[PDB]
Amino acid sequence: TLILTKNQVLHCQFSSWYSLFRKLTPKAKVIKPIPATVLKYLHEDSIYVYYPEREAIQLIEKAIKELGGAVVPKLNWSTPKDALWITTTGSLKCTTAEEVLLLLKSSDFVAHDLNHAFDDCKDFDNADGSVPKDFSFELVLKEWFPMHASTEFRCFVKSKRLIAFCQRDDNYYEFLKENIDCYEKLISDLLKKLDTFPDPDFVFDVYIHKDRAWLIDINPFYPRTDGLLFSWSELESMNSENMKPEIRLIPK
Structure with a gap:
């Protein structure tokens, strides 16, 4: 809790x-x-x-x-x-x-x-x-x-690790799912650079365009921050020692 x-x-x-x-x-x-x-x-x-x-x-x-x-x-x-x-x-x-x-x-x-x-x-x-x-x-x-609204992501961090991220907008986009591994890498590389953020839990929004990641916003790890395709129940309970983040995109 x-x-x-x-x-x-x-x-x-x-x-x-x-x-x-x-x-x-x-x-x-x-x-x-x-x-x-x-x-x-x-x-x-x-x-x-x-x-x-x-x-x-x-x-x-x-x-x-x-x-x-x-x-x-x-x-x-x-x-x-x-x-x-x-x-x-x-x-x-x-x-x-x-x-x-x-x-x-x-x-x-x-x-x-x-x-x-x-x-x-x-x-x-x-x-x-x-x-x-x-x-x-x-x-x-x-x-x-x-900005291409569909290549923006919301990214959830717990104990300095990426536990999850999802598409930030709500319209289906073919392109994302055929390229999701590429997106995960860029996101996980950007988090590395966020190692100066003072709290171990937080949520960052990222824009990815032509193989380049942009930090867009940072928000508290707290249900006031919209979980979008994730619920805060599952976010709270996710084990942070996992290797692969959970990933969710908008359905066709």
């Missing part, structure tokens, strides 16, 4: 692991702490179609420029993958500060980051709405790029 600690949630902050793994992951910029004025804008629960003062706006705009003009935004933990419905494009791709703020303001995941991030934590009581010391919310802009 699994517990979530305050430090586990802190370790999965984008700013925490991006410094560790900068060379393994798509380029990004981090604005930390988040401008109090952006933070105020984001807490607005209005459903209809106040604003961050342009000091803050220009800061965001600079980041987009440095990253090539097209980005995917997130706060400390969650990508606003749920807010695809605020976009005309049906994309996370943002090219202006306005696109960024709209997408983030419209997301439940982002909302979850702001009000519920330390909710499940054993060793930290936030019922009074408080947060750990030296913690700050941050705004992350990652370089955008066209």
Whole structure:
């Protein structure tokens, strides 16, 4: 049975692991702490179609420029993958500060980051709405790029070993199953490089494209992290001393 600690949630902050793994992951910029004025804008629960003062706006705009003009935004933990419905494009791709703020303001995941991030934590009581010391919310802009959704994987690590991984998306893809051994090797090679991550149990998402593995995200080993094709019952009970990871792909 699994517990979530305050430090586990802190370790999965984008700013925490991006410094560790900068060379393994798509380029990004981090604005930390988040401008109090952006933070105020984001807490607005209005459903209809106040604003961050342009000091803050220009800061965001600079980041987009440095990253090539097209980005995917997130706060400390969650990508606003749920807010695809605020976009005309049906994309996370943002090219202006306005696109960024709209997408983030419209997301439940982002909302979850702001009000519920330390909710499940054993060793930290936030019922009074408080947060750990030296913690700050941050705004992350990652370089955008066209990703083949079906060659992204979610990868489960227990006691520093790869126990399982599955296809991250939910649409069948012929190609994966004829090449699965190639994918396992690249994934298990990348984990080797993650040996600086501080906790022995964690979940990492990986994008694999033309025989190259990219670290995309890191999340706690805890059922708040979506198990996708695996359940947390089986993940908890999997023996970590095994040789072959379990692998699951989407059915035809």
